[PDB]
Amino acid sequence: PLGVPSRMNIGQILETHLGMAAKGIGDKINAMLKQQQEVAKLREFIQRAYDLGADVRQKVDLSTFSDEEVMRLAENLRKGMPIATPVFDGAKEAEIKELLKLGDLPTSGQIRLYDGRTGEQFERPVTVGYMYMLKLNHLVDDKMHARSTGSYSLVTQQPLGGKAQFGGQRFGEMEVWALEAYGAAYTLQEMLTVKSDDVNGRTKMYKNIVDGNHQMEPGMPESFNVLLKEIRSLGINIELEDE
């Protein structure tokens, strides 16, 4: 109900009261008077939950007209097996409040339900009905991506997904400034070294977690090695210096 005040979409509540009162507006017409034509067991119970509330002379009645007539006054609206509504010239609140005081069961849309969990007499009768919802498709984005041990590239030591092994999440720069924004010093350190890059971290780590102990403290990363050899072959040089 809180998707209504911000996202201004009151027409789904129009469709909710509408699908509630489908038994009493214009599916009122084709639902029974045409027909329960295939099912001979609905033509005893549904024939009395219909005329108790709704009595508009525009909306045709069971007790006057037989099965073969609507199967002549509603051949014109057989394509509208439920109610028909155009886009901007359709239902009106003077017509909706006139056709919902009719519609079985409730009056003016709202009815006292009961809780499925507590049970008791439910305060403030609510807007219910039959909303026509829609399921979205399942693209391959919704498929679960599970990667622990796959292949690696040639010129870099990054993982790679594809046909058999799934794709791995990249660790982007804003993710670097989050753990960098934190006081965590070892998580971001092993995130760029032991996870992705180092050939000496992913092997020794996998050899120490299977023993039951901790993994060895991270030495040289592969970015330090590759970038350092990119520096050394030029005129400049980078050298790690101790304490």
Binding site: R124, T193, G235
Partner: protein, 1364 residues
Amino acid sequence: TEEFDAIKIALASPDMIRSWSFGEVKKPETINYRTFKPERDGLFCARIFGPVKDYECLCGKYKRLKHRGVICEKCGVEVTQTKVRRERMGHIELASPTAHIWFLKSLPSRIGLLLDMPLRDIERVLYFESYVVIEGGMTNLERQQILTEEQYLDALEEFGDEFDAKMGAEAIQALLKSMDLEQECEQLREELNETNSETKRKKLTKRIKLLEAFVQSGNKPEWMILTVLPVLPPDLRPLVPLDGGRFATSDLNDLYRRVINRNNRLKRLLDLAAPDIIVRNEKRMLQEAVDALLDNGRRGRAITGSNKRPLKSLADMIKGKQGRFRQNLLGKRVDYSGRSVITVGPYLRLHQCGLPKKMALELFKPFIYGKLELRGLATTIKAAKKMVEREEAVVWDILDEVIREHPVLLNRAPTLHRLGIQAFEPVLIEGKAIQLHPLVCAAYNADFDGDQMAVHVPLTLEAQLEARALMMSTNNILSPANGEPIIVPSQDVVLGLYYMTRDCVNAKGEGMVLTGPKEAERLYRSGLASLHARVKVRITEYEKDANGELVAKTSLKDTTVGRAILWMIVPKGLPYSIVNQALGKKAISKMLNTCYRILGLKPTVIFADQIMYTGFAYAARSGASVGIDDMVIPEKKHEIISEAEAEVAEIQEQFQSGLVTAGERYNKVIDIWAAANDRVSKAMMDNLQTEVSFNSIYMMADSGARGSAAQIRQLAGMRGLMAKPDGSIIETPITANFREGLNVLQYFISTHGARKGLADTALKTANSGYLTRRLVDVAQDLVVTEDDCGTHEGIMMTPVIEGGDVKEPLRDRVLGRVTAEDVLKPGTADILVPRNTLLHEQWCDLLEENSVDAVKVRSVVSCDTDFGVCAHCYGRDLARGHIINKGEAIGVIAAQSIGEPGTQLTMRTFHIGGAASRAAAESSIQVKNKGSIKLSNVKSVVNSSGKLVITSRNTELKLIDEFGRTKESYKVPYGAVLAKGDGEQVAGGETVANWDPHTMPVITEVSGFVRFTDMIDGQTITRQTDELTGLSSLVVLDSAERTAGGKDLRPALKIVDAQGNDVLIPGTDMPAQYFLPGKAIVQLEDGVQISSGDTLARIPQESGGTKDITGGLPRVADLFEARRPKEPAILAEISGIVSFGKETKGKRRLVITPVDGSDPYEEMIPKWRQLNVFEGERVERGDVISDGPEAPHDILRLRGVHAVTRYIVNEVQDVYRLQGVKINDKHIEVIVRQMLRKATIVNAGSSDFLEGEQVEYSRVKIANRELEANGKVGATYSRDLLGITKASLATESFISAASFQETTRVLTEAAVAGKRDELRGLKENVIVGRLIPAGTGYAYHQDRMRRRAAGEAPAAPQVTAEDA
């Protein structure tokens, strides 16, 4: 191992290259496709690097483990593992050395400034081309155009010869060893200041900043030339096939094979040992070979067949010429990671997450292999690698025993602020979606219609436990930006709790509490049979809370039971119920502030869980569903519609009849509809609060859940007005709403405003990390390291009133900041020696505002610490409410707190478009309440007309009572008359100011005599006649009506004394020379004595404005990137008196006369610029002149250091405070220093005047010489404000400024200085891969554990160490 202090970058020497490298690579010999063994002594060798297999030899003589250490006799090769082939190095002996193109194509040429050659010209003349072996000698003074001549004096033209000055770079060393450097270098400091010809001092002041870099502790210039080429590691470039007959290799395999085949050719073809004047053909091929290893694209790229792309060089992997810099910071792929849909976990808490159960089968498996051997699932480690790697139905039990106490890293990809990556315990949940906590959903700018997040796995027990006490979301409940919590009960939780403490209305609606007192029992007892109280109005008849719900359940009471049970559900799991009373609807975010300040954080966790359960659980117990009938139409709607529709017919008949014009009907048609929504608005909000109070759509917008005062009006009454996509308003209002029959026209009109919000976020949802990036690149080295500094230098004065949003606001800028000294403004409160102030202290600094003008406060921008900022000057904001701790990257959390609110800002275009406003003024100041008149920056004086006439505009005319509170805010233009002065008491409903909204009189400030200056009949003045006065007086002609020759003549009523000298204005050294505009009224004679306040001339008309304030993210890009605004204001270069020059409809002028020059200091003012300056008292330098922004470069030059650090942190908040986001001043100031970190000193103390060096080093140089002892030196400066795209371009580090596309000019700057890069920043520590300094990496974080067994255990060796 040990903590590494710092790294040092320097140029490579063969005495150093041959130290780590062994052997000698002679041929391009790789590993063949058949055998992996080395072929010959080339790039892949066993004697140089190492063998391939475990213990076998190359020939095949000894392969058994009997001979493991001793080498063979015929071919001695020691054998180890293949890992030593990676680390060991080799070096390629190049016969001729070559250049490094970073030192060549770069605009600051390292061999052109220091060694005086052309910086670009001769480099594109000598190196690749055919000009041959200048060093020294005695032929040609001219030193530029190399062939033929060329150093020091003989002989130019015809033929000459066919002087080093060599092609390539085998002898640029020999230029760097002699050009004669001694005639180029002691003499530098004399030619700058001594010789009057400034061509010699503007050419030689550029060439010391690279000259003194080698004189200092850095290296020598003779190592910029690449002599020996170090090899690439052997296993770093594998040669395996891809699939079948295709290959995937690096682009270095085609380039190291060429340099070696172009090396021995110069050695032995070419067996000479010749003079160097002969050979050309080899270094044109070898230099061509090494340039593809240097750079491809700066002169000529290196391409392959059917490939119009350059070969991927070693620099192109870093800078990304092909666009792979957008791929390097796109992210490195995590091997232990996943992705799925997100959903909501209500019963989930802030400690835990619910992730799917199939993802844990894959991502958590290395922790499973160490668990399978203890149980009966798997036997060994090898057979377990083929069962748990797949879908297995036995591992479900043994997986959960590892994940008892192992939280993970949750990750949403818009990782803007700190809380973008959070830590939670995994709960194994069926399905495919991860569960997200609802309080967390305020930190994640998201919804639940398709958003998908990631996850990571902590590996070591070191990094595991910091995901529980430092990374977990409920530990850090407060924002980095301000002291307000981001995580907050948002919509569904506050619905049942908001409805819970309510009272229905039939007659009476007060609030009641009876648990406790006794009077309201008898008072509210007898009402049950009366009309005052019922079964939903004012009743409670019971002692306590317990049986009130017993009586309420049996249909006798309805209200004050939820107020009775809310007072005991939440404080039962938590003590201190004295603070646990204020839930409210606007105090829903304030409870997580004061409950954290009074109580602890362990109160806050379960305190959020109880409010979580009783909030989300009872919302279904209320069941506040919105229907169509809940939207109650007011009765006053159709009456105001009927009155508004009946007036356009009358007004239309007025336009048809012709008695009125179009202008006075067109403003009436919009007037009758512009005030209709106000009259129908002030008819549903007062209808449902008196009749029904239990209305769903009223309570879901009256509360804090999701509601606005404009989105409810579109459904309920009438949506008022919609504008065009340009911005101009539509003349036809719209009247149908979402409830009634809404036609196609008004829906078509609403799309014009519906396209801006969603088309705004169209290209703003492809990309989300550059407004972060360009602001974290500048302030990355900001780390908390405080050692009892307590600095006083550069003290900042804070104005009690801010600079101004529109014309005159009233706001304060201090929050959580330390004080500078002892200030006693209040009567009860007192700030002592420096203490971190609270949120209550800004109301004390805002309360007594009529006494304070400068809040004494230590600032971030002025501190002694060079790399970091101390704990005092920064403040409190770390993650939580107490003081900052040591080791925090306060530069990235500051900038990312600026990148996150920029998403909701309006983005039209990066450089200013326009807006629309109207300027109006009234000469009717009537004070409402009583009190006194407070006046600031005014010089009141009584004239000869008997009127208290002011001499200043921008006078603060506010009603200040005996308590000092702002009640009014009025504007006083120039030339006004006050009824009462400053300090005199007024009464309610009394006029205290009156002027004319037609005339701005030219009113003097000093007494003396009036002397006619530059007024000649026929040139500047002409006898005319006014239209209102009727007196024929001397009237000055306009600027366009003047004759030829009077364009430079400016008329003046020059005020002199009785002695004929100039009368200076009191306060400044400004002569009183007021100019007469064209078409002025001069009713004054010559030589007659006047008094201070007499009217000289009048301004008959007033105009100006209509185009003004920008707002939004374009102003964010305008202020952080210091650029040119759309509306420049010509700021006054000199501080002094100001007086208008002209008043003509075409152009307006403005002239300031400091000491000697009056007339050439003219400032042209068009009609678009709204005049905010007056004709009186002196203005400051850097003061605003028009209705527009200022240039940050010139106000840096004029006013001082208390201007740009307070204008750039205040005006950016004028954007974010409009939308509602409150950002503290602490998180803007750390990048203001980084734009100010370089400057230019004027007095040479250690270096020369034009250096452009850093200022944190210059602060120590002025600190130790002036403060302590030893001959104090006035080493003053002139500042330099830059943009963040340039201040981060030239940094101290070389990888900090390598986040641009200009990695050529930075690496040479850190290369030639020998600069020791002390890695203080954290940005510069992830690319290098080392350990983070801010966490456990700082040197204070060194300790070890001790229990009582290991406390009595080392007591035995120290008794054992005692001898007998």
